Symmetry: C5
Subunit: 310 residues, 5 copies
């Protein structure tokens, strides 16, 4: 028969979410409760009912007693797992109580940037049993798992936390236990608002003010430089994300500003071409269309993305 292994995982801290590398880093406590009757002991009156062991004088004790421990792996772990505590408390009964306090980076392969910066992402930790379900079965330790109240994350906001059990077939033919701690998080848009939206809108709005000067060459010079600024913002955005094979909402927004700016250059080239061919009165009458085209083009673009993405 298989022995129940009680898994508990609690994330105390979110040391950071690195979206360029699609991983996240946490400070967490792993807790296991496992009754092995073979590990039970007799104690004399006055002698302790609970034996405290350092993993691995405990592992050395299991090898001596020829006992198999529920060897597990953090399936989505990355790099070094820095440990704080690896402590065992063994009761008279044979109940092993294990605590693993660590700092570690975990793969975040659920990353979908299609609606960035208005995106919601799934983050998880996979705890897998190396041995199959006929030997060990993972159970949910109640009263433990979840996320703490001082995570330290400022950009992200955790919407919900879940825990569940599933099978995996990594090293075995037969099903093996897998404990899952999942959490969903959405973004605080303040950074994007203050650094990208407000500046891009300002550049567009104050550039439109200069249309009231009625100098077509000055408009052309202005839209030309604006195009370079947007190319620069394009690089600012691209630095936050991986080199994706798909278009983001932000990417569409920037390509949109390129297209409109390109057309602003094209249109004011036409009006100045009229002035150059002795048709200044015509260009001055059409100028109302040039002045009102600019806000309509950006308002048409904004409605196009909002439709294409929502």
């Amino acid at each position: 028969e298989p022995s129940d292994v009680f898994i508990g995982l609690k994330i105390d801290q979110i040391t950071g979410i690195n979206q360029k590398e699609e991983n996240f880093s946490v400070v967490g406590s792993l807790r296991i409760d496992w009754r092995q009757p073979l590990l039970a002991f007799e104690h004399a009156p006055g002698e302790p009912k609970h034996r405290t062991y350092t993993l691995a004088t405990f592992l050395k004790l299991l090898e001596e007693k020829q006992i198999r421990w529920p060897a597990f792996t953090y399936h989505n772990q990355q790099g070094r797992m820095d440990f704080q505590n690896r402590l065992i408390s063994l009761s008279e009964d044979g109940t092993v109580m294990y605590l693993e306090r660590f700092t570690s980076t975990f793969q975040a392969p659920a990353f979908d940037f299609r609606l960035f910066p208005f995106d919601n992402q799934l983050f998880f930790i996979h705890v897998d049993s190396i041995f199959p379900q006929h030997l060990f079965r993972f159970q949910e330790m109640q009263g433990f798992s979840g996320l703490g109240d001082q995570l330290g994350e400022e950009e992200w906001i955790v919407t919900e936390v879940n825990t569940h059990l599933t099978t995996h077939n990594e090293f075995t033919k037969g099903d093996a236990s897998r404990f899952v701690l999942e959490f969903h998080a959405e973004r605080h848009l303040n950074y994007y608002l203050m650094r990208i939206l407000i500046p891009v809108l300002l550049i567009i709005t104050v550039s439109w003010f200069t249309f009231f000067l009625q100098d077509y060459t000055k408009r052309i010079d202005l839209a030309g430089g604006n195009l370079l600024l947007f190319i620069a913002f394009n690089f600012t955005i691209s630095s936050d994300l991986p080199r994706l094979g798909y278009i983001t909402l932000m990417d569409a927004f920037l390509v949109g500003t390129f297209i409109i700016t390109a057309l602003v250059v094209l249109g004011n080239v036409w009006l100045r071409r009229l002035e150059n061919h002795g048709k200044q009165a015509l260009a001055r009458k059409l100028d109302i269309y040039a002045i009102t085209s600019y806000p309509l083009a950006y308002l048409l673009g904004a409605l196009t993305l909002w439709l294409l993405f929502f």
Copy 2:
């Protein structure tokens, strides 16, 4: 009955405060005094009264003697704790004297940037007992804890240091001991003064000098470029802080310079529109308002933030 565990923590160095990641790094010495009568030993005349042990031939000795040690965790620790010394001195009495010399990063979740750069922050180290208060009780080792006199921090300045004891319920149902070393620090404004305030004020002041040239087009070109400079300073500031979900005093200050610059472009567009419509004498008379508006707008903005934040 529970055994008193005497906790002492001393920060020798502040290797740095990383406000983007909301953590801090220290070189510290942890000192513990714990009397365990079971660890007492008899010595022969001439033989040593104090046994010196490396943790973990000492831990190996505790496991042998079936003794439980006051297992603790640095609750707000992050990543690897690099140790320099982990030494035990055991007296005939059974008094364990432990010294833990380490370098470590700790979570700084008390970070409030709302008044940045005029902010004061709380930094702490949490030392928690894994075992509850019925087994072990943390006591304040007197004559030890605090901060050193060569911390090596140049930007921050420590205003006060405190030590206190409280309960926690991390791994247990019942209350467990927690030692706290807390310190408050404020910022040296010289960097912000020299690199952000003086340059932003200079750009504004020398830009106003050119109003005395009486060229409205030149003013428009100047305010336009100034707006781009402020957008660049906006990115310079944002690089120092996390991607916060809230507005800082600095953020308000930069948004303020955007608004005024936007209006300077708008106003000088109007004056130049008057000149273009054969009303140069009118624009020249109103020019006194345009020239005196600029300093009043920035002085009105400065009083608005100072009221909105103080």
Copy 3:
């Protein structure tokens, strides 16, 4: 006679491909099946048929029993290999079942950037036996090796995976076993399209629009600044790659835009020289060649690279 050592390697994650350092990083599981009759054991009825050991109480057991283990090296490994699990399961038969779960960077010396960004690269992991083929022979463990289905890589896309066995002569005179896990990957061009192709083409296209203004000095100023922008893009590209001794397709493309821009400056200098020497009507008639030269030069350049590289 030689003993068959069954090698299995599975890449769970591609933590990243760093093309500037020509290496890649993976999370992988190494699996070995090796029957050593000398390690066989007798067990009593009811006692376990499978002994579970931590490498290296298992290594300590081999040294005791004076047995030589199939010592191996990851030949193309770089830096620290962070281990998650190093576990042995020893059957009554003497069948050692070893699992090595690790995170590691590996040298990528197969990097050929000549057709970048339209390049396809070879990535491999070399597992070598330290002892020669007369002692140990590597065999392909079936049902294991390959790449997982949640690699987490966004820019690269794996085209095919292969496993094979070959000889090496690293530390021995005679041939020694080598297990090879190879994979080919091509690039998602979306990043290059959105950040380099679209911006470079936009700068060129909107710059051509201004030719319709018929101001030769303005064209010269525009081409001059465009040349500086391309020099800046040249640095943006160079930051992605190592300091190669050869020319890439991208390098040819940028040098191409330099040459054409240099000639645009040269040509419009000539047309403006005609206007300056009272030959404005001649320069205006030739202007059709100057306006249609620009698109033909870039279209001629594009066909030259496409021929020179394909």
Copy 4:
């Protein structure tokens, strides 16, 4: 009575001096000579007179023999100390000869940037005895300590090296031994000359050449842009240093160039105001003061800092 512990420290390499973090990194060899009569041994003819031990089979031997070793700490150490060698040679007499070869970062709290880049700094390594002077007394091992002849540092130049012994009271009530290896280093100014002084002087000198063009508007545009360049150099300098609470010689120099540039804008605004009010002949006569003011202002500024700092 107390036992003499002979301390020797030799820095082989300066892997770098990081002035932003106020620390330095070295590759060093620590050498200790300590006679413990209790460790003396009898050897049979033919058997070795010197026993070679790995620290810590040697430490395991001390714990067995119930002997206390002169436990020490590198007081100003930071982070991980990567060890190369930790070897003991024990003579028949009981003379322990210890060698500790390591790479480590050390706190540099003596950093005074007030005269940067013409500054001279103190760098030290503190080796402290954990046990007081009644048990162990540190002595200077002669013929060892100092700095090597291939340190590998290119910017800094070591002026002098010193070694001395003092007391500390870190973990004890009574005085405890402290070994000090101190060195003074000054900076090679070539980087600052080539990248900051020559460029800033060039910008100022070639900008003055254009005064001979007699275009006041062109001067205003030039001084305005020069001010932006100095603001950029201001950021270039600030990146090298910590966010100090005090003004450096460099900071004064940059603030100086801001003030003069601000005044150049102010003065040429006045001359152009004269020209605009039909007083061109007056502005042309005064122009000699404007042309000779510029070099006098920068020469007056240079004498002010040189007095204020020397």
Copy 5:
């Protein structure tokens, strides 16, 4: 003294960091050392070669009261990440040791005076802690050198050498030192494509505009060119340490500053002539201004080439 056979092979050059003057390699260290005291008797059927993990082998040496040839990688920096540390002990007492590692090593031989046309010396120093009366290092033949898949793209190894010398680090008397040395030169393609071609383009296309005959436009052009060169000056400085000496590249950039400064100065003079009603004079002299520019840069190029070669 007992002969200790040292062999060192660099499999990979993980990188050369010229700003920190160090280099990083993946290497295999191989030692052959006969200690008769370690010899063993084996029964028929029992193994003739005992395989040990360093340090059950070191634990065996301490037991047998034997001194091992303790060594240090003298020019090593930071952590040496090990892959393999394996011993094979023959019946004879021949210890066969293999040390597979990744490590950074100090490169103190760095001479940037002719950068980017420089050739540098890189080495690894393996020192015996014990003197030559106890242990003597010998060259293990058939092993040492550099591999054929080093993975370095900018540098090209010109030659590899191995030799033995003495050191006096921890002892009064001479102690053995094994040296693996290699010389490497640079692939100039990066400098050509990113620094030479752009700087020459800026200079050449800027000269084209002289044919416009607008002295103010030339002044504005040379002024901005000076700022571009100041920016390239920072681009170059980022690759190297904060040296106390001038490089060929530094001289080249200072050269472009001087010529650009003079271009501003000269066209200020020509425009001063035009402003003082002497346009026909400035137009005749303009041939000297137009032909001065290429001569100044060609004179500068010959000055550096002489001063450095």
